[PDB]
Write a protein that binds this DNA or RNA. Structure first.
Ligand code: SAH
Length: 327
DNA sequence: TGGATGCGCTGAC
DNA sequence: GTCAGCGCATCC
């Protein structure tokens, strides 16, 4: 994450729904905002959350009475994506994990915050011929909010990862916010090899598979794209090896393959997946963030998370728009 | 809501 | 045809 000198969100209160690692909390707090409520039902996510913020998030949002939720100015929610991701079965709203948005609508309808800041996977924008996004748009609209949605790639915001996600910013209508803008892309100057830990700390991640098939030549020049160098097995998910001179592939929560949830990388002649701390860095998390003691749970959490830097630039722009109140 | 890995199919070229 | 995906079902 980056440093924010102008705390655009000072004095504002927000809630952290589907909290996970608290990515939205880090981003909004760096802008001066105050978290007044968090909700996360996963046991291990709750532990790492408390480990970093000192509070245990409330469980199952579907069982929480929205009237009990504290007053807040900004509602943050990176809701479940398994049902909309290009990597899943795309059952969408028909999935028991695909209807969490209506819980968000329920909370908004009752708490009516100034802003609703949501995030989901790229395919969310195309799912069901665009009907899924349309439904969220109309729901927000009839809830009396404006709807700003756009898919941003983390590689355009200083993070070496081709992670694309849809960001949806909603302003209450009575606020007449007419100058909100998604952050503009800038040149990437950080690559995977810049975030890697020393070899001595990741030796245990070195995999020597005799079915490795290097398909491409290593590149000596850094590039803002993923560069596949080879595969193992059939080259499916978690079976692809990339260059550390390029950018990382999207970190995943339930990913499979020998290089599960991170992808494989060529590092000083050996192939290995990423270390939880490297996943943290690829997601824009500061080294001060405490990862979960279970590497398995940490991989799942970072793969489910958000890119801090991207949320910071957005949060900053949300605050800039809310603070523009000329006579 | 364990940890691990082989997998298959969709989306966007 | 190329290839990447906050995934999936199964195994222990
Ligand atoms: N019914 C429910 N109640 C509360 N939390 C839920 C939930 N269904 C899913 N979740 C939580 O929703 C999260 C979605 S992924 C969001 C991660 C978050 N942005 C962070 O930065 O890491 C998961 O952690 C999941 O456990």
């Amino acid at each position: 994450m980056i440093e924010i000198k102008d705390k655009q969100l000072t004095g504002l209160r927000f809630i952290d729904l589907f909290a996970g690692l608290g990515g939205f909390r880090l981003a909004l707090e760096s802008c001066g905002a105050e978290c007044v409520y968090s909700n996360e039902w996963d046991k291990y996510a709750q532990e790492v959350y408390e480990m970093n913020f000192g509070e245990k998030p409330e469980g199952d949002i579907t069982q929480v009475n929205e009237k009990t939720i504290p007053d807040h100015d900004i509602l943050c929610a990176g809701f479940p994506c398994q049902a909309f991701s290009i990597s899943g079965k795309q059952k969408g709203f028909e999935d028991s994990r695909g209807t969490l948005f209506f819980d968000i609508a329920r909370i908004v309808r009752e708490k009516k915050p100034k802003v609703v800041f949501m995030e989901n996977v790229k395919n969310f924008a195309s799912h069901d011929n665009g009907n899924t996004l349309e439904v969220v748009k109309n729901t927000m609209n009839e809830l009396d909010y404006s709807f700003h949605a756009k898919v941003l790639n983390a590689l355009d915001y200083g993070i070496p990862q081709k992670r694309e996600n849809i960001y949806m910013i909603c302003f209450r209508n009575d606020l007449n916010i007419q100058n909100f803008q998604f952050p503009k892309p800038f040149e990437l100057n950080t690559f995977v090899k810049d975030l890697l830990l020393p070899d001595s700390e990741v030796e245990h991640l070195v995999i020597d598979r005799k079915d490795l098939v290097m398909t491409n030549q290593e590149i000596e020049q850094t590039t803002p794209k993923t560069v596949r160098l080879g595969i193992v097995g059939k080259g499916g998910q978690g079976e692809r090896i990339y260059s550390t001179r390029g950018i990382a592939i999207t970190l995943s929560a339930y990913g499979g393959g020998i290089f599960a949830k991170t992808g494989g990388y060529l590092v000083n002649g050996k192939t290995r997946k990423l270390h939880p701390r490297e996943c943290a860095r690829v997601m824009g998390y500061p080294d001060s963030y405490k990862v979960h003691p279970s590497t398995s749970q940490a991989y799942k959490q970072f793969g489910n998370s958000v890119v801090i830097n991207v949320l910071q630039y957005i949060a900053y722009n949300i605050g800039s728009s809310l603070n523009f109140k000329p006579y």
